[PDB]
Every structure is written in structure tokens, then in C-alpha cells.
Design a protein around this ligand. Structure first.
Ligand SMILES: [Zn+2]
Ligand SMILES: [Zn+2]
Ligand SMILES: [Zn+2]
Length: 178
């Protein structure tokens, strides 16, 4: 197995996947690495299994249909994986913890949002449909772009949103378009 965490790229107390060479810190994996379970398969392996059991799940889908799906176990897992893919980018640090807003010429957002809040919300089964999760994720980046205005720091929001959106289209097999 790898000797660094797949998500944060650091060593430490790592848990190894039994079905692939990836490794994880306990709370870097989503959901948090399960207590017992031998063997244990990581979320990458669990996602690959869903795909393998239902090859047709990779055919193109409309975003509108995906968003309305209820958060049954497979859609729960897909949103956990998508959140984990955003944490995999180092730029996610800017959006992880609770933000605060005190900049001359800007006002903070009406509804602040951050990754760890979305993580807790998933863990607590607070989303009933994929749409709830996707709306909170997109709100993170929208708040950032609106608050930072013309500061070049707005680009970090565009960058991490692009990681989100690419992974959303991949994981949920959104129909390819120009
Ligand atoms: Zn880690
Ligand atoms: Zn694995
Ligand atoms: Zn089938």
C-alpha cells in the first residue's frame, strides 16, 4: 500500500485499503474509516463496485434527473466520494472551515457555507436528495466569488469549483456535451 494518505498526501496513522493500494487517515476518508471490518475496502473501491455491478450506470444522464434523486445508500456514497474528491485538492483548505467576512467594500454572504459543514450534514443524513448536497457545494464557491469581487483571490473559488464540477460529471455520469 501507499505510505501517504490519498487525500492530504501526508504520512501518519494510516489505514490501508484491502482491495487497492490506497491509504487514509481516519478522518480524511469519508465516511471516517470504519472501526472493525477485515477486510476493508475504501470509497474508491466501493464506487468501482457499484459501477461494475451496473455497467449501464455509466451511460449519460441529465443533471436535472440526478439532482432529484433521493439520497438512498448508493447516492449517499456518491456524494461522500464527490466531497472527498474536493478535499483531495490542496486548495480545499480555503473552503474547509467556517469563514468570516470583514473586507472594506464587501458584505458577507447571507448563507455562509463550508466543506466541513457539508461533511457533517452528510454524516447526519440531513440531505434527502442529491440536489441538497449539490446546492450547498455550489454555494461555497458562489459566496466566495461574490465576496472577493475583483480581488485575484476570487480565482481560488473558480479553481476548486472546477474540481467539484468535473468530479460531479464523472461520478454521476452526466451526459457529455459541448
Ligand atoms: Zn490525510
Ligand atoms: Zn481501495
Ligand atoms: Zn445490471
Amino acid at each position: 500500500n501507499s505510505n501517504i494518505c490519498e487525500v492530504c498526501n501526508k504520512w501518519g496513522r494510516l489505514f490501508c485499503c484491502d482491495t487497492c493500494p490506497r491509504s487514509f487517515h481516519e478522518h480524511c476518508h469519508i465516511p471516517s474509516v470504519e472501526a472493525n471490518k477485515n477486510p476493508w475496502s475504501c470509497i474508491f473501491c466501493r464506487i468501482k463496485t457499484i459501477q461494475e455491478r451496473c455497467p449501464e450506470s455509466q451511460s449519460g444522464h441529465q443533471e436535472s434527473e440526478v439532482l432529484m434523486r433521493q439520497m438512498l445508500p448508493e447516492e449517499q456514497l456518491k456524494c461522500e466520494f464527490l466531497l472527498l474528491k474536493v478535499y483531495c485538492d490542496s486548495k480545499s483548505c480555503f473552503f474547509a472551515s467556517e469563514p468570516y467576512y470583514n473586507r472594506e467594500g464587501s458584505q458577507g454572504p447571507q448563507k455562509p457555507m463550508w466543506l466541513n459543514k457539508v461533511k457533517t450534514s452528510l454524516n447526519e443524513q440531513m440531505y434527502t436528495r442529491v440536489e441538497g448536497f449539490v446546492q450547498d457545494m455550489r454555494l461555497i464557491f458562489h459566496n466566495h466569488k461574490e465576496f472577493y469581487r475583483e480581488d485575484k483571490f476570487t480565482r481560488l473559488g473558480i479553481q476548486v469549483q472546477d474540481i467539484f464540477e468535473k468530479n460531479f460529471r464523472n461520478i454521476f455520469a452526466i451526459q457529455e456535451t459541448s
